[PDB]
Design a protein around this nucleic acid. Structure first.
Ligand code: FES
Ligand SMILES: [K+]
Ligand SMILES: [K+]
Ligand SMILES: [K+]
Ligand SMILES: [Mg+2]
Ligand SMILES: [Mg+2]
Ligand SMILES: [Mg+2]
Ligand SMILES: [Mg+2]
Ligand SMILES: [Mg+2]
Ligand SMILES: [Mg+2]
Ligand SMILES: [Mg+2]
Ligand SMILES: [Mg+2]
Ligand SMILES: [Mg+2]
Ligand SMILES: [Mg+2]
Ligand SMILES: [Mg+2]
Ligand SMILES: [Mg+2]
Ligand SMILES: [Mg+2]
Ligand SMILES: [Mg+2]
Ligand SMILES: [Mg+2]
Ligand SMILES: [Mg+2]
Lengths: 86, 97, 74, 72, 48, 23, 128, 137, 58, 122
RNA sequence: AAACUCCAGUUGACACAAAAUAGACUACGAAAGUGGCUUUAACAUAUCUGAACACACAAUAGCUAAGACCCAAACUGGGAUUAGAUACCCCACUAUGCUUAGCCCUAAACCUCAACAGUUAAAUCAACAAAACUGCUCGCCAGAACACUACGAGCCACAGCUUAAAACUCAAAG
């Protein structure tokens, strides 16, 4: 309301490529957390339920980031079996 | 006895501890150019430490300085001041890909 | 499996026996059913590698002790 | 070992030289080990300071023909 | 040492005698608190 | 654990409150 | 209360502070400091008036004086903040802690226990 | 020059022009993408209404308004009325995450308008009014 | 870097209240999840609209 | 103790800006303040539109006043600034240079937490 | 469907309401609790343990009195659904959530894991859960149900809270 307009969340279209511009805008809102925040704000999330979700989302980040670290660590070993026959 | 036995030392090859880009520097709420480097250019959202790369002490200092600068009439809230859009990029985030 | 061929040759050369393959359940504790009632079990078992391919002790280490067979192991 | 302190400083000042370690040869002497050996000899003379003793060691190797390119 | 430093600084403090002169001097001057950091941790002062 | 012990107490309290209101 | 012109406990013994400019003197006085700086002076005055060794801060005497200065600060805080339940708890706990210190001092050194009660105006009361 | 996704600042001097008009003078297409309806109003750079079209004004009723095709039809209708008044280039300002958030934009392009920028203005309270209670479904 | 797990769970040596309340032990399994099928959307809705709009005119 | 007054003044001509700055410094001194320095940060566009005293402001003159005052003076000065119609926004903060930043050795690494679950074979 | 059309969209002015991002941080407080900004005051104890009742606190709901009105919302009304629908779904609106001054003293107030001091060796260890233990102290528990009940007593509580049985019944309950 008080801020200047057409500066925040504004993306310029390149060569009339509106699809790519919209995808860029949607990716900016997703990475900053605005999209997921808007969906959670539609109905009131009670504090205990918010704490239960945040705890869930944090444990998933931990597990997922550790699994991914193990996948990248072991990927080199996907090479062909060097002792074929033993 | 023998002279070739291992002796007790502290790891002489130990590398110095890593320091964040703001280690040892004063974070002032008046310094809006610095503070703008840690907010989203599109939404004004403060970046987390996994993006800024700051230590816990400087992440708190930057956060508290931004919240002070914003309400005291020094910094915008909903976007990054366009004047600071060409400052050195120090945050590990890419929007275009 | 990098040394299965070497170990199997070394055993044949000295007139002994080698087991470098997947160790099937009961080779030692159920031998009389697997091989025959009059089969003679080894008197000594030498482990050149005591770990299986999931970095856990080779099952034969436990089964050798069950059968009271002395074991040498690197 | 005591020489680890010297080895650490040498690698920091000069870094691993282009000469590649040959670990198959049991008597291989790297440029760092040559420095350690010389440094240890100059310590027997009676020098009690690291800075001067360290600098003097580098000069001796340069006279012998060793290439010591500092990181700088 | 702190008392000595303070005794020097108080000589430049604004008083009721020099208030008007110091206000005019402030209106002429500019103080900039802005500086940017780089990925190498170096301060980039503003060029203006 | 199941909530069978809570359920017995839940009905006791509900019925008691309803009784107190009635009388 | 110590006058507002009283110099801070840190600058009271620096040589030549009696000759510095008036502006410097009020910048190093209690007037320009927070409430905690004036409590350090209250503690010092009680220590010099009561304790035999004003520099021993680990004796049961010095600890009763230090706690009594805190108790008074909580009572003054609560005179303005009558619904501050956190500080009301700190006051009541501190009063109980001082009573335990006074019971121990009375049991070990009665002569000094009398000087604590007179200097600080504490009336020892036996528990119910 | 490299393309800048960042919009031109109104105060600064820019070379980017659209039919001889600066970015600050291009008319604005305000899209309200709700969960059940899409409303499109094209206004001039001085806040003069030019065209309005919603899924309701196009004849869709009840749950049929909350569809991409309905929003696309409203976009085409708004573009037609705006193009009669002289609008070619529009700055889109979309509000909400409804089904017709993108479809309304396609309709505006299918209707002959050129979109030069997209701004999202979905209202996000920074702490605000407590929303309605969660639905038990 | 993975978020820290030090002092996050309710344990005998932890004085603070638990930060996390995992419903499953935070231990890596020996499997990953199956590849999720993509939920289908109605295709050819813009072209269908263009043809049906023309039918209405003609 | 030492404070910093961040004063955003209405965009005025030099004679009125000088009177307001004198007015403000005299109010500090009347409440027992020792004013140390006055810094001009320049006139700039405000980060957002600020409505003050029934006026909408888009520009202002930023100024800083470093001073010493008793703790009780802060509340009184805040009240005085509220009634001044030439001040867009005034905030008194504890001077940032009084606080001493502790020396930092650097980032101490924290390893993966261990022994969170018993070593029994589930 | 009802409802609204004194409606909706853009723009401007505009709270005694609530506090995106930071926070992938794990801090503060005795617990309850505490995450917008500023300032003031301010976070007991130089051995430890020590109370259903003493003393001081104690989420939410609730009570008394005076105010505040964005939004939410028990109850209630309307729409829909249904065999019925005193519900789940939609709309409207109140008590209530807020401030001030007094009450009430409850929670799955549970991290169901007491305070302080130590240990990782031995028999590690029923099972599961969050590995097994030592010293010391206070509190508490001795089949299920009756029973967060009856009676007595205390209480600003009066449809309340705290303390808390027995008879009959069963051979299980857990
Ligand atoms: S690592 Fe030193 S302050 Fe960040
Ligand atoms: K906030
Ligand atoms: K209880
Ligand atoms: K619990
Ligand atoms: Mg279950
Ligand atoms: Mg019953
Ligand atoms: Mg569970
Ligand atoms: Mg109708
Ligand atoms: Mg968050
Ligand atoms: Mg105790
Ligand atoms: Mg008792
Ligand atoms: Mg309560
Ligand atoms: Mg109430
Ligand atoms: Mg409402
Ligand atoms: Mg109401
Ligand atoms: Mg709780
Ligand atoms: Mg206890
Ligand atoms: Mg109860
Ligand atoms: Mg009862
Ligand atoms: Mg009774």
């Amino acid at each position: 309301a008080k801020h200047l307009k057409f500066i925040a969340r504004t993306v310029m279209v390149q060569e009339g490529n509106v699809e790519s511009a919209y995808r860029t805008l949607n990716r900016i809102l997703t990475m900053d957390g605005l999209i997921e925040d808007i969906k959670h704000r539609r109905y009131y999330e009670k504090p205990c339920r918010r704490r239960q979700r945040e705890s869930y989302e944090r444990c998933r980040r931990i597990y997922n980031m550790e699994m991914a670290r193990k996948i990248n660590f072991l990927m080199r070993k996907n090479r062909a079996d060097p002792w074929q026959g033993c | 006895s023998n002279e070739d036995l291992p002796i007790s030392m502290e790891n002489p090859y130990k590398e110095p501890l890593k320091k964040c880009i703001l280690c040892g520097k004063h974070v002032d709420y008046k310094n809006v150019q610095l503070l703008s480097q840690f907010v989203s250019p599109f939404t004004g959202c403060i970046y987390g430490r996994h993006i800024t790369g700051l230590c816990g002490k400087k992440q708190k200092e930057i956060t508290k300085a931004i919240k002070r600068a914003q309400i005291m009439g020094f910094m915008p809230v909903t976007y990054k001041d366009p004047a600071y859009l060409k400052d050195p990029k120090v945050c590990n985030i890419r929007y275009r890909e | 499996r990098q040394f299965s061929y070497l170990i199997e040759n070394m055993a044949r050369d000295c007139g002994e026996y080698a087991h470098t393959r997947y160790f099937r359940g009961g080779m030692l504790t159920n031998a009389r059913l697997l091989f025959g009632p009059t089969v003679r079990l080894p008197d000594l078992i030498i482990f050149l590698h005591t770990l299986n391919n999931i970095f856990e002790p080779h099952v034969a280490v436990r089964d050798a002790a069950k059968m009271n067979i002395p074991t040498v192991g690197i | 070992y005591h020489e680890d302190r010297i080895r650490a400083k040498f690698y920091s000042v000069y870094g691993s030289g282009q000469r590649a370690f040959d670990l198959f040869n049991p008597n291989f002497k790297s440029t760092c080990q040559r420095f350690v050996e010389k440094y240890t000899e100059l310590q027997k003379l009676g020098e009690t300071d690291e800075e001067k003793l360290f600098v003097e060691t580098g000069k001796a190797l340069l006279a012998e023909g060793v290439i010591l390119r500092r990181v700088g | 040492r702190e008392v000595l430093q303070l005794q020097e600084e108080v000589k430049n403090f604004i008083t009721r005698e020099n208030l008007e002169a110091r206000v005019e001097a402030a209106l002429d001057s500019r103080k900039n608190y802005n500086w940017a950091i780089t990925r190498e941790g170096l301060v980039v002062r503003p060029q203006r | 654990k199941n909530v069978l012990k809570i359920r017995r107490r839940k009905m006791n309290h509900h019925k008691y409150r309803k009784l107190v209101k009635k009388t | 209360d110590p006058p507002p012109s009283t110099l801070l406990k840190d600058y009271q013994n620096v040589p030549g502070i009696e000759k510095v400019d008036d502006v410097v003197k009020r910048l190093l006085s209690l007037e320009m400091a927070n409430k905690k700086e004036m409590l350090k002076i209250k503690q010092e005055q009680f220590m010099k008036k009561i304790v035999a060794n004003p520099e021993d801060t680990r004796s049961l005497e010095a600890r009763i004086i230090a706690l009594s200065v805190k108790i008074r600060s909580y009572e003054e805080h609560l005179e303005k903040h009558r619904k501050d339940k956190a500080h009301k708890r700190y006051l009541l706990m501190s009063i109980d802690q001082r009573k335990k210190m006074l019971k121990n001092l009375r049991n070990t050194n009665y002569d000094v226990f009398e000087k604590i009660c007179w200097g600080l105006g504490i009336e020892y009361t036996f528990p119910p | 020059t490299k393309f800048s996704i960042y919009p031109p600042i109104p105060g600064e001097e820019s070379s980017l022009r659209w039919a001889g008009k600066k970015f600050e003078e291009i008319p604005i297409a305000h899209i309200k993408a709700s969960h059940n309806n899409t409303q499109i109003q094209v206004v001039s750079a001085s806040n003069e209404p030019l065209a309005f079209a919603s899924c309701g004004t196009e004849g869709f009723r009840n749950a049929k308004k909350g569809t991409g095709i309905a929003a696309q039809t409203a976009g085409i209708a708004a573009a037609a009325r705006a193009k009669q008044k002289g609008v070619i280039h529009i700055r889109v300002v979309v509000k909400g995450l409804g089904p017709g958030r993108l479809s309304a934009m396609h309709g505006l392009i299918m209707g002959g308008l050129e979109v030069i920028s997209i701004t999202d203005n979905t209202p996000i309270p920074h702490x605000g009014c407590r929303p309605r209670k969660a639905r038990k479904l | 870097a993975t978020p820290s797990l030090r002092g996050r769970l309710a344990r005998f040596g932890n004085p603070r209240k638990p930060v996390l309340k995992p419903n499953k032990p935070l231990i890596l399994a020996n499997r990953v999840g199956e590849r999720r099928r993509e939920k289908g959307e109605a295709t050819c809705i813009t072209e269908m609209s263009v043809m049906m709009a023309c039918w209405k005119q003609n | 103790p030492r404070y910093e007054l961040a004063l955003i003044l209405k965009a005025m001509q030099r004679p009125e800006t000088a009177a307001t700055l004198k007015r403000t410094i005299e109010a500090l001194m009347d409440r027992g303040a020792i004013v140390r320095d006055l810094e001009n940060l320049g006139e700039r566009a405000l980060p957002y539109r600020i409505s003050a005293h029934s006026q909408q402001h888009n520009r202002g003159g930023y100024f800083l006043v470093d001073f010493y005052a008793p703790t009780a003076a802060v509340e009184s000065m805040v009240e005085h600034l509220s009634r001044d119609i030439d001040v867009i926004r005034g905030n008194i903060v504890k001077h940032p240079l009084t606080q001493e930043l502790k020396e930092c050795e650097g980032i101490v690494p924290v390893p993966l937490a261990e022994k969170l679950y018993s070593t029994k074979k589930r």
